[PDB]
Amino acid sequence: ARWFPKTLPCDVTLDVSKNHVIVDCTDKHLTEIPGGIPTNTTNLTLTINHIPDISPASFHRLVHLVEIDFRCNCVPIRLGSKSNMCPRRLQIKPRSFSGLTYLKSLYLDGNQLLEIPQGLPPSLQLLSLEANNIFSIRKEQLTELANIEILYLGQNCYYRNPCYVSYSIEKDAFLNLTKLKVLSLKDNNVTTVPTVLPSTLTELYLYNNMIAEIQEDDFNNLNQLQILDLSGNCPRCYNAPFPCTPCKNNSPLQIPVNAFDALTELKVLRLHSNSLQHVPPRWFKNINNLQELDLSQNFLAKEIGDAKFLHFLPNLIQLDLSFNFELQVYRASMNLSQAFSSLKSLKILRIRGYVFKELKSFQLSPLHNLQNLEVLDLGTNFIKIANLSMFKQFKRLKVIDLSVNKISPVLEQLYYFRYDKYARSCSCYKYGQTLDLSKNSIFFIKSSDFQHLSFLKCLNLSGNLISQTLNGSEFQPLAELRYLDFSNNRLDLLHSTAFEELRKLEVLDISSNSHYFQSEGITHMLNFTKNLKVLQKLMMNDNDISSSTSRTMESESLRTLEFRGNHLDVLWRDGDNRYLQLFKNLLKLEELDISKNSLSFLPSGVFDGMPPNLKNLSLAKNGLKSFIWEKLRYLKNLETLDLSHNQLTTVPERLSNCSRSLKNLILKNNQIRSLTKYFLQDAFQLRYLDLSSNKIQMIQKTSFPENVLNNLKMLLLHHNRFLCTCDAVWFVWWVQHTEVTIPYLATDVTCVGPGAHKGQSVISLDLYTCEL
């Protein structure tokens, strides 16, 4: 099927449209650039390997290279692996790049380089040198970059990669880079804004440095600047999770009132963690296009009640005023200036970490007529009191976020407090209006608590303290609710009428409501599903369900049931038949997850008891030690079977004879040591087979008929125990010449033996001695 097997340890892709031959050698544990890279190579990535030097031999035949991605072949010690530390810096010999006359993009990040590499071709638009050791920039070393448009030099002098001096930039070092659009000098122990910069700049990143003052003319010529980030200069260090040095005397970064006067094109201004106490309106006199303003992690608590500068921001789309609270102050309420009402274009307002006790309808009145307002984020404010009905005036919003508060009767986890959220490494909103009350202190709910909110489509009550029996009266206003996240509470299913007032409910999450399931003898009405006539998806993961008063759950609508992390092993205790049809009357059910239920065996009757349209079944992570494969015949619509992370030792003698419908068979992470002689014979439906991470020693042709392998979209075989003796001649030859997609041939389809061949990839294996 192939005449010339591919030995090269890299994935090779063709994009015929834009004549790219893409060679990806990412993370292939290479010590040398592999031989045989196609000479038509346009994109070549060698990121995360251990190639210790580059030379003219490196790319010698690769004349058409347009991009070389050579990041992280010698990561700085504190940022890289401690088990495989890099012994010496990358070495780049002369002329290594000069012949590549079409090279447009060169990334050399994370290689412990000490200088800007010279000899670069004049075609280069993008040079990336992050996380190296270059902390002195001289105009001489930048003459070669005449046509450069994007230049990343950050992370070369900071706490994860110290240089122990101030960064240095000669005057007008960048000024003759006349074509330069993007300059990044973040995380560099820079002490002043470098001047003069080329007026072609559209983006300037100077954040996380030691710039204490802006000079009035530091940005005088940047009439095309669109994004400017000065954050993390004079940081606000309270509860910082990284080493943090504030400016002396609690000074802020000092910005003259006229410092921005030239930036007419500015669209994004970021002044995060600059220890600001005031925001002069004069700052924005000449910026009418500003769309995004980050003022998080300053000391603007008082200014938020005044905030005259908002009158100069009629086109602002995003405003972030999070974490401006005064230390050790717990304000009574939020004092939002009337000036917010002049934010006519505002879509997103974030004020986390203002820290106040009580939220009242009128305090949000400055926002009532912001017509384009879509997201209001008041999370992490320790609000104790809030009448939810006030959001009846905010029905136009897409998300109201009150997450992580103490109310009673999507951004990264680390976001406002991480050092460099843009650091490069080597959900129910779609349903409509969302009220996020997650991680609050609601211990009891009542119908009137939701009143005037019948417009809500998604309500997140995850992670409250609700230890209550529901009887159908608690949610009555919520006539349009489609999604209820009730996870991480203490739901008590005493009555089978719970949730029945949510007539339009399509998704219910009651996972991690294990509390009342963990004490013996307590009544549990699992048959509450019957009353929910449009319910599509039910999640009850991690509930430790080991007993149930009702014997059957019923639904004519339910399509997906997640039941992972429970104790079906106890419910189905061998000899107890009462619950073998717990799911039989979920008539429309197509997907069932009963992984992690400690099912080390399946009792008689489990398969016969499944609902008739079951398509996707997971029995993963059960400690399954045995499996009667014939009983799949009961599952006449079964299309996906996930048996991963179990203890199986055998596959069926004839998979076609067990399931005529089975299309995807997942057996990864088991104990299988051999395949049956006619395993896949006539399994014409099979499309996907994962046998990886087992203990298979040999595979013979009878098990793998090629009319079956031809239809496989993927066949996974890596991390097994293959013996590369002359008995493996067909398997080795087939693996080398087949077109079937088999991931990891280059890294993890290997011989364990015999002696000579140990550790060797079967793709590279030469068995001519077997036919002498």
Ligand X SMILES: *[C@@H]1O[C@H](CO)[C@@H](O[C@@H]2O[C@H](CO)[C@@H](O)[C@H](O)[C@H]2NC(C)=O)[C@H](O)[C@H]1NC(C)=O
Ligand Y SMILES: CCCc1nc2c(N)nc3ccccc3c2s1
- Choose the contact partner of 157 out of ligand X, ligand Y, ligand NAG, none; CB within 5 to 8 A by kind: ligand X
Pairing of strands 182-184, 91-92: unpaired
SS3 363: helix
Per the annotation, does 529 bind a ligand?
A: no
Stretch that binds ligand X, among 18-26, 69-77, 159-167, 564-572 (CB under 6 A): 159-167
Phi and psi at residue 109, to the nearest 5°: -65, 145
To the nearest 5 percent, what fractions of the chain are helix, strand and coil?
A: 15, 15, 70
Q: Per-residue DSSP letters for 63-79?
A: TT--EEE---SS--TTT
CB of 167 to ligand X, least distance (A): 8
User: Counting contacts by CB under 6 A, is residue 168 touching ligand NAG?
Assistant: no
Residue of the chain from 22, 64, 159, 674 that contacts ligand X (CB under 6 A): 159
Contacting residues toward ligand Y, per CB under 6 A: 323, 325, 330, 353, 355, 380, 382, 469, 492, 494, 516, 521-523
> Which sign, positive or negative, has the C-alpha torsion 185, 190, 192, 196?
negative
User: Counting contacts by CB under 6 A, is residue 238 touching ligand X?
Assistant: no
- Choose the contact partner of 549 out of ligand X, ligand Y, ligand NAG, none; CB within 5 to 8 A by kind: ligand NAG
Q: Identify the residue whose tokens are 């087992």.
A: 694
Stretch that binds its own copies, among 158-166, 203-211, 420-428, 608-616 (CB under 8 A): 158-166
CB of 733 to ligand NAG, least distance (A): 31
- Choose the contact partner of 355 out of ligand Y, ligand NAG, its own copies, none; CB within 5 to 8 A by kind: ligand Y
Count of residues engaged in binding its own copies, rule: CB under 8 A: 55
Query: How far apart (Å, rounded) are the C-alpha atoms in residues 433 and 460?
Result: 11
Q: Binding string to its own copies for residues 403 to 442, with x set by CB under 8 A, is what?
A: -x-x-x----xxxxxx--------------------x-x-
Neighbours of 83 (CB within 10 A): 5
| Pair 114, 133: CB distance under 8 Å | yes
CB of 524 to its own copies, least distance (A): 8
| Pair 310, 343: CB distance under 8 Å | yes
Residue of the chain from 6, 50, 64, 104 that contacts ligand NAG (CB under 6 A): 104
The reply to whether omega before 63 is within 30° of 0 (cis) is: no
Nearer to ligand Y, 523 or 764 (CB): 523
| Pair 129, 154: CB distance under 8 Å | no
| Pair 187, 208: CB distance under 8 Å | yes
CB of 164 to ligand X, least distance (A): 4
| Pair 693, 668: CB distance under 8 Å | yes
CB of 195 to ligand NAG, least distance (A): 30
In 3D space, the residue among 654, 502, 496, 487 whose CA is nearest the CA of residue 564 turns out to be 487
- Choose the contact partner of 189 out of ligand NAG, ligand X, its own copies, none; CB within 5 to 8 A by kind: ligand X
User: Counting contacts by CB under 8 A, is residue 495 touching its own copies?
Assistant: no
Nearer to ligand NAG, 436 or 690 (CB): 436
CB of 492 to ligand Y, least distance (A): 5
Q: Binding string to ligand X for residues 181 to 200, with x set by CB under 6 A, is what?
A: --------x-----------
- Choose the contact partner of 163 out of its own copies, ligand NAG, ligand Y, none; CB within 5 to 8 A by kind: none
SS3 677: coil
CB of 103 to ligand NAG, least distance (A): 8
Four-point Cα dihedral 26, 28, 33, 35, nearest 10: -110
Query: How many Cα atoms occupy the beta-carbon half-sphere of 75 within 13 Å?
Result: 17
SS3 91: strand
Count of residues engaged in binding ligand NAG, rule: CB under 6 A: 36
10 Å CB burial of residue 82 (0-12, 13-18, 19+) is exposed
User: Counting contacts by CB under 8 A, is residue 730 touching its own copies?
Assistant: no
Q: Which two tokens stand for residue 582?
A: 């717990």
Specify the DSSP element, H or E, that contains 729: helix 729-737
Strand partners, 228: 204, 269
Stretch that binds ligand X, among 164-172, 345-353, 476-484, 739-747 (CB under 6 A): 164-172
Per the annotation, does 39 bind a ligand?
A: no
User: Counting contacts by CB under 8 A, is residue 515 touching its own copies?
Assistant: yes
In 3D space, the residue among 32, 40, 37, 34 whose CA is nearest the CA of residue 16 turns out to be 40
Per the annotation, does 401 bind a ligand?
A: no
Residues 6+ apart with CB under 8 A from 717: 691, 692, 696, 699, 735, 742, 749
- Choose the contact partner of 165 out of its own copies, ligand X, ligand Y, none; CB within 5 to 8 A by kind: ligand X
| Pair 659, 631: CB distance under 8 Å | no
Residues 6+ apart with CB under 8 A from 241: 414, 417, 418, 419
CB of 281 to ligand NAG, least distance (A): 14
User: Counting contacts by CB under 6 A, is residue 767 touching ligand X?
Assistant: no
Four-point Cα dihedral 280, 282, 283, 288, nearest 10: 130
Stretch that binds its own copies, among 159-167, 273-281, 370-378, 387-395 (CB under 8 A): 159-167
Per the annotation, does 13 bind a ligand?
A: no
CB of 163 to ligand X, least distance (A): 5
Query: How far apart (Å, rounded) are the C-alpha atoms in residues 304 and 298?
Result: 11
Stretch that binds ligand X, among 36-44, 156-164, 172-180, 255-263 (CB under 6 A): 156-164
Query: How far apart (Å, rounded) are the C-alpha atoms in residues 248 and 210?
Result: 12
Nearer to its own copies, 146 or 752 (CB): 752
User: Counting contacts by CB under 6 A, is residue 506 touching ligand NAG?
Assistant: no
User: Counting contacts by CB under 6 A, is residue 246 touching ligand X?
Assistant: no
**Binding residues for ligand NAG, per CB under 6 A?**
15, 20, 22, 43, 66-67, 104-105, 302, 305-306, 335, 387, 389, 392, 403, 427-428, 438-439, 452, 460, 462-463, 471, 473, 483, 485, 496, 525, 527, 530, 549-550, 633, 657
Residue ranges for the known binding site for Ca(2+) are 766
Summarize as ranges the residues that interact with its own copies (CB under 8 A).
77-79, 81-83, 159-162, 239, 241-243, 323, 352-353, 380, 404, 406, 408, 413-418, 439, 441, 443, 463, 465, 467, 515, 518-523, 546-547, 549, 570, 573-578, 600-601, 625-626, 647
User: Binding site, residues?
Assistant: 382, 406, 492, 523, 766
What are the residues binding ligand X (CB under 6 A)? Answer: 157-159, 162-166, 189
